[PDB]
RNA sequence: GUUGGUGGCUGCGGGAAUCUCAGACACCUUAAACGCUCAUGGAGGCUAUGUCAGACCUGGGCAAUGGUCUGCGAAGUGAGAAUCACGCGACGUCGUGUGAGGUUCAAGAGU
């Protein structure tokens, strides 16, 4: 019943509270590159990297590392350790991107949920919009920068999600459609889920944005504006796709107890919402393909 | 140089659709296309079809035929505005601070 959910709330920090977010993202990237260089030159362990980070915080040259939140740097070091272990079971550096995130752990109520505000360790009260009601213990907050004027805080909480009631239909055969995104079928009626509106149009706008960026000189101010616009259109495409898939998968979970482009997001959302709401997933051409998928999935399940 | 009817390009409204509002518009019963302003800039920008190859393809090779915009100024470059209500400061505006923003549905995300 207790599920880990990420109440992504749009942050609206002031000038100081966003300067600090920038200086913490840069610091988490810096303490990543520095210790990656140290690890590469070594051929360090968790204790060694923690001690060297503490010395850097006390170092005169890099004293500003202690200004940013400590949990961001600790989790940056943890991510570096995991990446190094995966490469051993020497990854590339971290490049300054538009979309960069840091996460802060929870300790002695350093992070608190306000009405239209969010409390963060070095930031104070950060104004938020669309604060979905939270009734669980905060685990960590992934303060991020989608692009220049867009910040978010994936407040990971342990909120007890309740299982949904009994479902009207027993299965929903879904398969990748040619024209439609997918065709669902309870078994008799073929509800063809058409692709979300203005999806080819927004892909065309994405191509125009990519062409505009490639026409500009890197490191320029107008190049920065075009890069931000490309990031905005990427975020808009992600929002449209994820909203289409959220609505489709919630409709599938509510309407059907079983659910037999962006298909990766579709499958991820379907699986985690099936786990959350108490469902199961078994993992003429379109209609017959969907019917066969439904029949085989139901046979495998039972 | 037009009172009027439909359409969505951009900005805020957390997300999607829709809607107000605002910056521009576009056609005339049609439902498509497009963000805008100023300065600089000086010849290119967009698109359809063909190619495996400019969104270059995989040390080798291809970048063709048309339409469309464009010297009445393209790309690039620098600077700006784009919801509402209260104040504060300075000359009806400009900054600056705070607050609010409709309906339905939805909302785990990240290296």
Query: A126 vs A74, A112, A119, A151, CA distance in Å?
Result: 22, 10, 6, 11
Boundaries of every domain in chain A: 2-160, 182-301
Is the Cβ–Cβ distance between A33 and A62 less than 8 Å? Answer: no
Chain B positions with an atom below 7 A of a protein C-beta are 9-18, 33, 35, 45-47, 55-56, 75-79, 97-100, 105-111
Is the Cβ–Cβ distance between A172 and A260 less than 8 Å? Answer: yes
Token output for A148: 């220049």
Give the nearest nucleotide to A268, CA to C1': B108
Give the nearest nucleotide to A14, CA to C1': B97
**Would you say how long chain A is, in residues?**
302
CA angle A221, A144, A7 (to 5 degrees): 140
Give the nearest nucleotide to A222, CA to C1': B77
Burial of A99 (C-beta count, 10 Å sphere; 0-12/13-18/19+): middle
The region that residue A7 occupies, defined by phi over 0 for left and psi between -120 and 50 for alpha, beta otherwise, is beta
Is the Cβ–Cβ distance between A148 and A137 less than 8 Å? Answer: no
Query: A182 vs A194, A196, A283, CA distance in Å?
Result: 7, 11, 15
* A154 Cβ within 7 A of any nucleic strand B atom: yes
* A246 Cβ within 7 A of any nucleic strand B atom: yes
Q: How far apart are CA A9 and CA A23, in angstroms?
A: 21
Experimental method: cryo-EM
A256 contacts: CB under 8 Å, gap ≥ 6: A167, A168, A169, A170, A171, A172, A186, A279
Is the Cβ–Cβ distance between A169 and A279 less than 8 Å? Answer: no
Token output for A291: 């019917």
What are the two backbone dihedrals, phi and then psi, of residue A119, each rounded to the nearest 5 degrees?
A: -100, 130
Burial of A104 (C-beta count, 10 Å sphere; 0-12/13-18/19+): buried
Q: How far apart are CA A51 and CA A72, in angstroms?
A: 16
> Packing angle between helix A46-58 and helix A15-42, nearest 10 degrees?
130
Query: A189 vs A40, A167, A194, CA distance in Å?
Result: 60, 17, 15
* A5 Cβ within 7 A of any nucleic strand B atom: yes
Resolution, in Å, please? 2.8
DSSP string, A169-224: BS-----B-SSSSEEEESSS-EEEEPPPTTHHHHHHHHHHHHHHHHHSPTT-HHHH
Block residue for tokens 């006390």: A58
Q: How far apart are CA A175 and CA A179, in angstroms?
A: 12
The separation between the first and the last C-alpha atoms of chain A, rounded to the nearest angstrom, is 25
Block residue for tokens 């600090």: A20
Burial A233-268 (b: 16+ CB within 10 A, else e): bbbebeebbeebbeebbeebbbebbbbbebeebbee
């Amino acid at each position: 019943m207790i599920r880990n959910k990420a109440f992504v709330v749009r942050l609206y920090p002031n000038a100081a509270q966003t300067e600090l977010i920038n200086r913490t993202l840069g610091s988490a990237r810096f303490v990543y590159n520095h210790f990656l260089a140290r690890r590469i030159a070594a051929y360090l362990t968790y204790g060694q990297t923690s001690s060297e980070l503490t010395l850097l915080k006390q170092a005169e040259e890099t004293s500003w590392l202690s200004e940013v939140d400590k949990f961001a740097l600790q989790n940056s070091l943890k991510n570096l350790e995991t990446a190094y272990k995966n490469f051993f079971r020497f990854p590339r550096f971290r490049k300054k991107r538009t979309g960069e995130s840091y996460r802060t752990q929870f300790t002695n109520n350093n992070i608190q949920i306000g009405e239209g505000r969010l409390k963060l360790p070095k930031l104070g009260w950060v104004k938020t919009k669309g604060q979905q009601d939270i009734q669980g213990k905060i685990l960590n907050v992934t303060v991020r920068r989608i692009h220049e004027g867009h910040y978010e805080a994936s407040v990971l909480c342990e909120v007890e999600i309740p299982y949904l009631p009994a479902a009207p239909k027993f299965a929903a055969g879904v398969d990748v459609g040619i024209k439609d995104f997918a065709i669902v079928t309870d078994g008799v009626r073929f509800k063809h889920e058409q692709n979300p509106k203005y999806y080819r149009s927004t892909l065309k706008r994405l191509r125009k944005a990519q062409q505009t960026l490639s026409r500009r000189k890197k490191g320029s101010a107008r190049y920065g504006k075009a890069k931000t616009k490309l990031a905005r259109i990427h975020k808009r495409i992600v929002n449209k796709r994820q909203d289409f898939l959220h609505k489709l998968t919630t409709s599938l979970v509510r309407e059907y107890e079983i659910i037999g482009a962006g298909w990766g997001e579709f499958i991820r959302q379907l699986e985690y919402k099936a786990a959350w709401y108490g469902r199961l997933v078994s993992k003429d051409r379109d209609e017959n393909a969907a019917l066969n998928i439904r029949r085989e999935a139901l046979v495998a399940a039972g």
